[PDB]
A and B are shown apart, each in its own frame.
Chain A
Amino acid sequence: AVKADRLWHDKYALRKPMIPSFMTMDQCRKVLLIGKSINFLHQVCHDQTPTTLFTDLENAFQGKIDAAYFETSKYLLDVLNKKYSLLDHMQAMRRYLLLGQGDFIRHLMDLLKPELVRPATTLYQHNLTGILETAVRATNAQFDSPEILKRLDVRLLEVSPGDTGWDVFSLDYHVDGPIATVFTRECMSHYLRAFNFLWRAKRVEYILTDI
């Protein structure tokens, strides 16, 4: 079985009964990580980068292991934080998905008030996406990277059967592939739940301010 999302445990399992007496658990973990990084780079990152005591245990064995590990890990980290993914995506969802913007969110709920009052059944994500995009063009998010901007997306997340649209509105911020391979579509669920929580909180705040 092969996958491009879950390939942090996928198709690379550690076999317990197949370890030499001269092979140790931490060494196994390090070599597994190095190999998985190489596999991800060559397969999911589509990048081809060359990887250049007598006894029967040696000490240069572990030295080579550690040096190659630090080489592979550092190179892959640079590749992933420079191309494809970026740290700015987390900052991005911090700014946007953590309601750091404020004015973005303020005007968002300003425009949603005329809509989410309508029954959830009476709503149309067709107009909601235009509301989203026009608000983003209105706010400072337009001055940010277009990649994170394209990473955003509004969704109609079923919350109430026929209640107000305030409940069913949601954002998805789809991110897929080698870009943000992490979150396994399980942490983003928690992020969405927290988004709903803070959305209700901010709505009731604005209610109080309006009153």
Chain B
Amino acid sequence: MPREIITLQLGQCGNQIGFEFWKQLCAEHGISPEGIVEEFATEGTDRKDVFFYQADDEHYIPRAVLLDLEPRVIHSILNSPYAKLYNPENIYLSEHGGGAGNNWASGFSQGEKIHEDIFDIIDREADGSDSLEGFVLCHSIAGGTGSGLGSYLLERLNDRYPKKLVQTYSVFPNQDEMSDVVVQPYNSLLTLKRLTQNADCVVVLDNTALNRIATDRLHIQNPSFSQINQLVSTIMSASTTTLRYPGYMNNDLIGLIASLIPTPRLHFLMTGYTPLTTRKTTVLDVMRRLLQPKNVMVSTGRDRQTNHCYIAILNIIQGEVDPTQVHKSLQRIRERKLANFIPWGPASIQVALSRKSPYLPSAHRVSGLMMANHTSISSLFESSCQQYDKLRKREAFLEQFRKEDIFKENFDELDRSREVVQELIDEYHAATRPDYISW
């Protein structure tokens, strides 16, 4: 059976990026903004029964749900002409005002309040499908509303249905600047602890490098959140491309994630895509540019004295290519030794050939999206942990977590989150060395 994936749009930023993703999918499949089939959408090979369910009137209704604690973003999305894409049953209107004030505690408590008011919808969307491969959760860890809500919902779903793939699209706040919500790192830390406890494969989405590419690779003096969301939706929708080609390999998300993840705690994957533009390329150019630390969407700290090993390297290559090109590109990159692997469990650089949809306007021969399990992100975690630690050193803005009595009773939840993150970072450090078998 064709397993589906359910989309969870949370928070202002998560809802925005989820809409961007869904519009990108609609563009790829070639369907009308109402979700009705077109003369150039159904005559191809792309399988549109993976994220959209076919109706009885050729309506590929998206397998997505809209949740928020403030209805204004919901109304704005409704104003879009892609409101006809979704069913109203697929949409829940916020019964809360002002979101959760961007507080992890507030969002978590409100998600606890709406336990079944979301559970009913999720169960309806689930049992409406034969089999589901897993879940996809678009969210922003910066937004405390969505952060707490997602933590609650991840707990609930992991408890109730321990039989699906748990994926979240965690918007990582900018390290380029400090936001007015100074307790944002703790919220993120709590969310990160939940991810460590619950999530299975994390595609990290740092806003700092997004800003950097936008300023440089999109050439804007002041990037806007909307254009950033547009570009990130484009780059993330490029991921599922292999899933849309049922002609080469099984290519199931569960297996693809499992082909790289060593442990359910070490489930964090980088991102990197080419081309980025506001010409002529061969296979060897693809990974050759990917090796450059210029097209990564995930940045790390200022660390240069600690070796970092790319635990797993994979690349999806969308475009018309030749098998000899891939065969030689792999050997050539390996001989140039532009990568590393664990000495005890040494691995290789997996490739995924795929071809472009005819309904996708093509202006380039190839397009590459990298998936790397790597150690640099620990620095970012450290960057957060330090940001947490000093904040926890300052013991500032804890009244936000004293509004909700759950944290007013004890801040030991933050301490346990910090401990778990430290354990994970030490796990990464050990993974850098052959002794990881002992750890």
Contacts and interface: CB of A to CB of B under 8 A. Distances in A.
Per the CB under 8 Å rule, do A and B touch in the complex? yes
Interface of A: 95, 100-107, 110, 138-140, 202, 205-206, 209
Contacts of A206: 250
B258 interface: yes
B246 A107 contact: no
Contacts of A102: 246-251
27 contacts: A95-B247, A100-B246, A101-B246, A101-B247, A102-B246, A102-B247, A102-B249, A102-B250, A102-B251, A103-B2, A103-B47, A103-B250, A104-B246, A105-B250, A106-B250, A106-B252, A107-B1, A110-B1, A138-B1, A139-B2, A140-B246, A205-B250, A206-B250, A209-B252, A209-B254, A209-B255, A209-B258
Contacts of B252: 106, 209
Nearest to A106: B250
A100 B355 CA distance: 14
Chain B contact-residue range equals 10 to 19
The 5 closest A-B pairs by CB, nearest first: A209-B255, A102-B250, A100-B247, A102-B246, A103-B246
A131 to B, nearest CB: 13
A110 to B, nearest CB: 8
Contacts, number: 33
Nearest to A101: B246
Interface in B1-27: 1-2
A200 to B, nearest CB: 15
Dominant secondary structure at the B interface: loop
Contacts of B258: 209
A88 B306 CA distance: 56
Nearest to B45: A140
A110 B254 CA distance: 15
A138 B2 CA distance: 9
Interface centre among B1, B249, B254, B258 (most CB of A within 10 A): B1
B47 A140 contact: yes
Interface centre among A106, A139, A202 (most CB of B within 10 A): A106
A100 B248 contact: yes
Given A100-B248, A110-B1, 13 more contacts: A100-B246, A100-B247, A102-B247, A102-B248, A102-B249, A102-B251, A103-B47, A103-B246, A107-B1, A140-B246, A209-B254, A209-B255, A209-B258
Contacts of A202: 250
Contacts of B1: 107, 110, 138
B405 to A, nearest CB: 44
B244 to A, nearest CB: 11
Contacts of A104: 246
B343 to A, nearest CB: 23
Interface centre among A95, A103, A138 (most CB of B within 10 A): A103
Contacts of B246: 100-104, 140
A202 B47 CA distance: 22
A107 B252 CA distance: 12
Interface centre among B47, B247, B251 (most CB of A within 10 A): B247
Contacts of B2: 103, 139
B157 to A, nearest CB: 21
Interface in B235-266: 246-252, 254-255, 258
B5 to A, nearest CB: 14
B49 to A, nearest CB: 8
A106 B1 CA distance: 8
A89 B2 CA distance: 25
Contacts of B249: 102
A105 B248 CA distance: 12
A208 to B, nearest CB: 8
A146 B361 CA distance: 31
B162 to A, nearest CB: 15
Contacts of A205: 250
Nearest to A95: B247
Interface in B114-158: none
Nearest to B1: A107
Nearest to A135: B1
B246 to A, nearest CB: 5
Nearest to B42: A143
B52 to A, nearest CB: 15
A25 B57 CA distance: 64
A17 to B, nearest CB: 49
A107 B1 CA distance: 6
Nearest to A110: B1
A138 B248 CA distance: 19
A202 B258 CA distance: 16
Nearest to B43: A143
A139 B2 CA distance: 8
A106 B253 CA distance: 13
B1 to A, nearest CB: 6
B43 to A, nearest CB: 10
Contacts of B247: 95, 100-102
